[PDB]
Design an enzyme around this catalytic site. Sequence first.
Site, PDB file in Angstrom:
ATOM      1  N   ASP A  35       0.039  10.467  -9.439  1.00 47.04           N
ATOM      2  CA  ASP A  35      -0.588   9.284 -10.024  1.00 47.04           C
ATOM      3  C   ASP A  35       0.438   8.186 -10.268  1.00 47.04           C
ATOM      4  O   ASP A  35       1.156   8.217 -11.273  1.00 47.04           O
ATOM      5  CB  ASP A  35      -1.253   9.681 -11.350  1.00 47.04           C
ATOM      6  CG  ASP A  35      -1.959   8.525 -12.028  1.00 47.04           C
ATOM      7  OD1 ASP A  35      -2.140   7.487 -11.372  1.00 47.04           O
ATOM      8  OD2 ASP A  35      -2.347   8.686 -13.214  1.00 47.04           O
ATOM      9  N   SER A 199      -1.012  -9.613  -4.492  1.00 48.69           N
ATOM     10  CA  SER A 199      -1.546  -9.799  -3.154  1.00 48.69           C
ATOM     11  C   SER A 199      -1.745 -11.283  -2.889  1.00 48.69           C
ATOM     12  O   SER A 199      -2.032 -12.062  -3.796  1.00 48.69           O
ATOM     13  CB  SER A 199      -2.860  -9.031  -3.011  1.00 48.69           C
ATOM     14  OG  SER A 199      -3.531  -9.344  -1.810  1.00 48.69           O
TER      15      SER A 199
END
EC number: 3.4.23.22
Length: 330
Positions: A35, A199
Amino acid sequence: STGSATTTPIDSLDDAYITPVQIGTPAQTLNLDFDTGSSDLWVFSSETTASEVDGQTIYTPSKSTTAKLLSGATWSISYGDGSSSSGDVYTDTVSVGGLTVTGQAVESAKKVSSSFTEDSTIDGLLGLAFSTLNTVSPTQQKTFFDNAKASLDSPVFTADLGYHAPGTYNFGFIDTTAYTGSITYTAVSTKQGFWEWTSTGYAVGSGTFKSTSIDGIADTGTTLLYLPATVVSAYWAQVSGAKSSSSVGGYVFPCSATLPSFTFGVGSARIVIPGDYIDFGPISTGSSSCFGGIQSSAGIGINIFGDVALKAAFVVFNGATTPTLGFASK
């Protein structure tokens, strides 16, 4: 040193991925959920409340000659999905894919929430976010990666998750045969303890690319792609009959649909998520309403590039002095 381990979807939907991890001496192999959005290595154990264990493999520290109680240390964690676990702490030898760390904090669960109990395939979590998020008190502990880092050939790990197929976590090297083209690297902020990056935009299907900054985290422990409501609405508007359902808890779409791809930007590069990766199947057995793999982050408080996004790429988690993230097509 290096390590390399195969990671395998837990079910036909790629709801999560498990990776075998050797703990203790002699080795006890548990299948852990790696994770990159948390920083605790915790396991089902011989100390876990018996009624809360249902099929998981447990770590038994008393059977490990290298286990040592970390005196006074406790831990308690709550995840973004509302699940939780807590317990006490041992140090022991932990190996992943041939890479060994001695003295790793292994957090033994005394209590786990129902969602963990109900998932027989996940024996615990191995956190790979920054150690500043580790919950051990009163002495915070380091992640497996942080402990291994100095010994690694290069201070990196990579995630290469498969679509309905196994993939690979590598530590200490970049497998140049595992991706196509070049890896595009992008800046990381560690201010919130995550692999947080920005992004450069998105496209839906064959549509034009929208240049827009989307701050979010690269999180292997989250199944879906959670993005701003504007972006998500633009995606689902291209699927006839799709709608946001408050009763179901997100966007659903007719199972008869063909889903468009979704592209996200990494600098000037582009990662394309095929439409099929966005299908999470019937909302309940036999339903013709299917659950979408792109969902709104509104009210999560952060955008999350979870498995839906990451499995479309070869992803480099660069833990150099100034961390960065790399993405390549594959």
